[PDB]
Design an enzyme around this catalytic site. Structure first.
Site, short mmCIF file in Angstrom:
data_model
loop_
_atom_site.label_atom_id
_atom_site.label_comp_id
_atom_site.label_asym_id
_atom_site.label_seq_id
_atom_site.Cartn_x
_atom_site.Cartn_y
_atom_site.Cartn_z
N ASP B 217 0.84 -1.19 0.00
CA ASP B 217 0.00 0.00 0.00
C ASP B 217 0.88 1.25 0.00
O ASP B 217 2.04 1.15 0.34
CB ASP B 217 -0.95 -0.01 1.19
CG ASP B 217 -0.23 0.04 2.54
OD1 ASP B 217 0.16 -1.05 3.03
OD2 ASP B 217 0.03 1.16 3.05
N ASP B 219 0.08 3.87 2.20
CA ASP B 219 -0.32 4.54 3.43
C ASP B 219 -1.46 5.52 3.16
O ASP B 219 -2.49 5.10 2.63
CB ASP B 219 0.88 5.14 4.16
CG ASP B 219 0.58 5.48 5.61
OD1 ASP B 219 -0.06 4.66 6.24
OD2 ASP B 219 0.90 6.61 6.06
#
Ligand SMILES: CSC[C@H]1O[C@@H](n2cnc3c(N)ncnc32)[C@H](O)[C@@H]1O
Ligand SMILES: CSC[C@H]1O[C@@H](n2cnc3c(N)ncnc32)[C@H](O)[C@@H]1O
Ligand SMILES: CSC[C@H]1O[C@@H](n2cnc3c(N)ncnc32)[C@H](O)[C@@H]1O
Lengths: 273, 273, 273
Positions: B217, B219
């Site tokens: 990901d 964040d």
């Protein structure tokens, strides 16, 4: 507080390595047990006289360096010194340097700190029902800071007259990335592990507390990174100078800290709700 | 240490999701209970052979992802692996990225970290009476880092060859303001929750520890903020590649870490007072 | 949950000083004990009606300001409010300002925070076996934030429409060096001690939580540093305005938070593994 032997009092506390204590100087030394509501201080407190000033010596790591920074019973240590009646507390500490001009062997008398600890379990004496928030904008006792600087300069020693101490949790030393934050982001000058919550508790106890730091290393920044062996060696190489400063400063502490140069001496006047 | 079954030993530890363990590869697997002075490791340690190298698998969250980062018994986990005799520890971890070029699905082999945890209760094995301060300027084992990078590049995978891992407390993910500090103030590259105190303890145990991170990901930084569902999905999408790297690297670990490329392999030589 | 008296429910929680509660407004007030798996909330929860909306008042410090920030049972407080059925939580807080234009007496409705706490012992309700990582990129409930801003602007009060709250551990106030980090390095706007882990827990409980902050001081930055006396005085000087905003906002909360403007209202949908 109950003490054994009974009735013991002192005026100046000295917190640091047990090697600071010199049996060749201290008159009528006694090992003292001071009750606290937090259990045992790091070791016996040795009370005796230096030039007619009553001193309470307390090795924060214990004799033999038994107790690492995160395991110290800070509350017991400061409670015990306060219970003895001390007004002044001189801390002697090994620190790393984040700046080339703060060299190993130099003293530093910090004026500020940044608390990067996490695991010290109690950062205060006041858990309720009286809520206490002491002002620590200027967290050290300026009177005592200036006395330490003066002593070093009279002895001919390098003593840096300010500095920001970053207190890290440890016991492991900083990574390079962390050290770059301390140095380049926070703009700190020195680094150690024991200042916090010692200083907080001293302030809450209305003590005049100041740190005499000795630079022992440059953290990650020299050719080889700091090791414990390095710190201990350099500290022991310089302990005699630290003793000379202690025994020079203490005789001049027979009186009281100057309230207007002691940020914590009346801390509770406006801190308690 | 007592083990059940008795007598079990291993040479390489693997810490990560239980999905890394492949019963189609590991010869003569056994679930092992290793006593520790800290209680239970996260789960059974599964010991078996990969190309004649004895591996101890330990899912840090437990099978089923039962144990969030703050609740892991890091001390028990590392003690148990050390007690088995391991010399090398490969951690496999999901991380967020703070930089566009560290994309989901890319591996990262970090070289640095910044500890922003607070609630892990023990950051060391050494609480006294032997005070130990390990040097962690270079906190990962360079030998193993280079082996992981080489394996990924031989398999044709993206593997970023450096990175600063910011370890946050969690379990909640970062605020945007925090993420901006991590990215723009600390200049960190990846973010996770489990590195610390795992790495500290591995260093103190004189293990050669390195992290194989998988970016899952960005964040706060993409259109939608990271969620746990996203992390888990992307990790499970990429776990097979992580397995390919593990089973490529492990056969080459039959020997010992190179002392001059293993910062922690003799950590205690200069760390203990 | 068991309550005494039995059967009590509420729709809006109010967390703050006990002085916010006005017996001249709240219809049919009852002191309620709400069982929790974490022990006692800070004080009785007072449940009663404001314009037909059922409100649960909970002074986080207890009546009389008995409980400092680090000693608050955040888990019990949030569990109890959730157990009562609340959907909305209005926090009222005293904060310091890090910027001249956020003046004492001004309201601030923060939108972000940076957690610099360390000693709060539990930062989550989820310690396993269901691992939960809530997204807190946007940690406050936008619906409620906008309602608070609107109320203040309708009443003619200054209400800053954004801000980053740095949550420090306390109870001691920041050093100057720390305050410079907060202000100049982290670029934060306000500072307090109680937001975290309150907000984390509220998010995990799928509550729509927002903070109405009142600036009480400029931390280290004015002529004299902040003291507790100063905070309390300024807060009590301004509490009536805070009450006016509360009693203006609450009547409009009879319905539900808007899911698309409530980051936490379905937090568990993608957070649990
Ligand atoms: C004797 S080795 C450990 C001690 O070194 C002190 N110290 C010296 N140099 C550093 C450094 N670079 N980083 C942190 N603490 C240090 C710490 O306060 C600790 O108690
Ligand atoms: C499976 S969801 C939780 C895991 O995500 C990892 N991780 C992945 N992305 C992030 C992120 N953005 N921030 C923090 N930890 C993350 C953490 O180490 C944690 O155990
Ligand atoms: C009543 S004095 C203590 C309270 O002041 C609030 N607060 C106000 N000003 C500041 C400040 N400058 N720094 C930190 N907390 C502050 C904190 O959340 C705490 O509960």
């Amino acid at each position: 507080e109950i003490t054994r032997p009974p009735g013991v009092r002192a005026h100046v506390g000295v917190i640091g390595g047990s090697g600071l204590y010199d049996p060749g100087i201290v008159e009528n030394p006694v090992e003292v047990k001071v009750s606290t509501p937090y259990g045992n201080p790091s070791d016996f407190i040795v009370v005796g006289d230096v030039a007619g000033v009553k001193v309470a010596f307390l090795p924060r790591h214990g004799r033999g360096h038994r107790i690492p920074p995160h395991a110290i019973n800070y509350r017991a240590n400061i409670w015990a010194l306060k219970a003895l009646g001390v007004k002044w507390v001189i801390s002697v500490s090994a620190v790393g340097s984040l700046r080339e001009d703060y060299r190993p062997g130099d003293f530093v008398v910090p004026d500020q700190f940044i608390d990067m600890t996490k695991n010290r379990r109690h950062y205060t004496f006041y858990d309720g029902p009286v809520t206490v928030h002491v002002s620590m904008a200027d967290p050290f006792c300026e009177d005592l800071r200036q006395r330490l600087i003066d002593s070093g300069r009279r002895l001919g020693y390098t003593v840096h007259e300010r500095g920001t101490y970053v207190c890290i949790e440890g016991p492991r030393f900083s990574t390079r990335a962390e050290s770059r934050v301390w140095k380049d982001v926070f703009k700190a000058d020195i680094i150690g592990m024991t200042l916090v919550p010692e200083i907080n508790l001293a302030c809450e106890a209305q003590l005049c507390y100041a740190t005499l730091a000795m630079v022992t290393d440059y953290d990650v920044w020299a050719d080889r990174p700091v090791t414990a062996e390095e710190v201990e060696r350099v500290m022991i190489s310089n302990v005699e100078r630290a003793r000379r400063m202690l025994y020079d400063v203490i005789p001049k502490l027979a009186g009281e800290p100057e309230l207007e140069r002691c940020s914590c001496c009346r801390a509770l006047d406006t801190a308690a709700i």
